[PDB]
Amino acid sequence: DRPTPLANIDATDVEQIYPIESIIPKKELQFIRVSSILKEADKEKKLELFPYQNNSKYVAKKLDSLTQPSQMTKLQLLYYLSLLLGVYENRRVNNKTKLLERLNSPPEILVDGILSRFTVIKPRSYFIDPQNEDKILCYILAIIMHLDNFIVEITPLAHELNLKPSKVVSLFRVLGAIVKGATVAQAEAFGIPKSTAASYKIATMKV
Structure with a gap:
């Protein structure tokens, strides 16, 4: 029915939104x-x-x-x-x-x-x-969410998958992820310049 794996509607932890059973x-x-x-x-x-x-x-x-x-x-x-x-x-x-x-x-x-x-x-x-x-692609991205611990940098991923960044952004949104610029906190953790962190897109799942 949907391009995404079957979501667990009762999920209280991000890990449980797309259980492994739903993917494989x-x-x-x-x-x-x-x-x-x-x-x-x-x-x-x-x-x-x-x-x-x-x-x-x-x-x-x-x-x-x-x-x-x-x-x-x-x-x-x-x-x-x-x-x-x-x-x-x-x-x-x-x-x-x-x-x-x-x-x-x-x-x-x-x-x-x-x-x-x-x-x-x-x-x-x-x-x-x-x-x-x-x-x-949505099952690939649900897997990436599990493997990158529910915080994904769009730009390196788009390059790695040979996909347009706007397609990765769009599909993460279809998955229910929030896609926005990195916080100054995330910039320190990811090692990206603080002054332009807002332009560096991050996909995050939330409960």
Whole structure:
């Protein structure tokens, strides 16, 4: 129905607005295997294990922070983000066979899950309509909200995702995030000049 994951209307903490269950069904989770990524010492080899190889800037940046077994769930979300990004960047592909050729051997059930929930079957051959296209991006952005602890800098993210900054702003607003300039406090934390912090856009979720 909506391009966003199903919100928890009773949420009292930002973490609960978009529960993990809303982003990835519980049944699809045992199939996101991240132990090898966590154990692999070489960053190049870690990156090679991701389901989409078109050198995601976001994945490589975010990887450096996900090193402990307590962060396994976050690492599964990053793996899934990579797959969704692969489906989005290859949105013009209309069949499962060509799609798999553009991807780095993800478990087939995850691809099936994406095709059944983010595409329409042509009356097998499929179509990603304009709404399903934004749905893919909204789930990517809901993941980023979990991974960046509900405070996101628009400008580096737009660059990392190869998306127009105004599209990132617009989609974060569709997700219910507040998008405005950084406070002098946020400027100190983010290491951005205080005098123009108002022009540096930040997306935040609130309860």
